[PDB]
């Protein structure tokens, strides 16, 4: 986005240390748990009755990996999140009917998961750069809504 060279590098370097598999399953699960209303799109996933049930759900786990996968790829197009997510933006609007506010919630959950994982390494300035990315991605995903 309006990422600084130094900001671009910090994002880039932390991400290189991320296990998308684990972080994706954790981010989505935490979302379903912290903000229970988000479960409205995943009725077909099964048992989301408890934190334990959400966190253990493999459908949740596999969806999280798909989402973070797409997010991951977007980090390669930080200069055109808009064009990178145009088709996904249309899909989310036109087929999935997902309120873009959900993109924002996930973003913040993602930031908590990174802090959780990297502790010390996730410094205030590194958080600042990720907040910009997360906001940039949410905006890009919401861009084609009409």
């Amino acid at each position: 986005v309006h990422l600084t060279p130094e900001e671009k590098s910090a994002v880039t370097a932390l991400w290189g240390k991320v296990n998308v598999d684990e972080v994706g399953g954790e981010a989505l699960g935490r979302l379903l748990v912290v903000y229970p209303w988000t479960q409205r799109f995943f009725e077909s996933f099964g048992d989301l009755s408890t934190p334990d049930a959400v966190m253990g759900n493999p459908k949740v786990k596999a969806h999280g990996k798909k989402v973070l996968g797409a997010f991951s790829d977007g980090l390669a197009h930080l200069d055109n999140l808009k064009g990178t997510f145009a088709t996904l933006s249309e899909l989310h609007c036109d087929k999935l009917h997902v309120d873009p506010e959900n993109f924002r919630l996930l973003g913040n959950v993602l930031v908590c998961v990174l802090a959780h994982h990297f502790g010390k390494e996730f410094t205030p300035p590194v958080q600042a750069a990720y907040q910009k990315v997360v906001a940039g991605v949410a905006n890009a995903l919401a861009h084609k809504y009409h």
């Binding site: 229970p36 209303w37 609007c93 309120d99 506010e101 959900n102 919401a142």
Partner: protein, 141 residues
């Protein structure tokens, strides 16, 4: 909290809405769909065309609920319990959308009650819709 003053203001302005509540409810929805397109994600099953019977029908429902909250201004949490449960457990509308509808409700009233829509009444009506929104979102988690 709503003060005695707020309560008088709301009963008075809503009093004037009278028989038009339904039509105003429908208009508020249309304004919301046009100004905040993301709210449409919650009505994929509706015909959102101008003069949609579904929108008309839905507008009446919303308006009836507000009318009911005014009638029970001293016991809103109980008067709206059912609606609070529905929104929390079935509809699961993200909280930010309540502020969007409230705003379009205020625009609609303003457009229709020039004489009653005073600064004081505007303030009371805003606090009221905020309170209704809070009740409807109270059982979310």
């Amino acid at each position: 909290v709503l003060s005695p003053a707020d309560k008088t203001n709301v009963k008075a302005a809503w009093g004037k809405v009278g028989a038009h509540a339904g039509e105003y409810g429908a208009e508020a929805l249309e304004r919301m769909f046009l100004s905040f397109p993301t709210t449409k994600t919650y009505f994929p099953h509706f015909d959102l065309s101008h003069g949609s019977a579904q929108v008309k029908g839905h507008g009446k429902k919303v308006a009836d609920a507000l009318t009911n909250a005014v009638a029970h201004v001293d016991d809103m949490p109980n008067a709206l319990s059912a609606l609070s449960d529905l929104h929390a457990h079935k509809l699961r509308v993200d909280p930010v959308n309540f502020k969007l509808l409230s705003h379009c409700l205020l625009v609609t009233l303003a457009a229709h009650l020039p004489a009653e829509f005073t600064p004081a009444v505007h303030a009371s009506l805003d606090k009221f819709l905020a309170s209704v929104s809070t009740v409807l979102t109270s059982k979310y988690r």
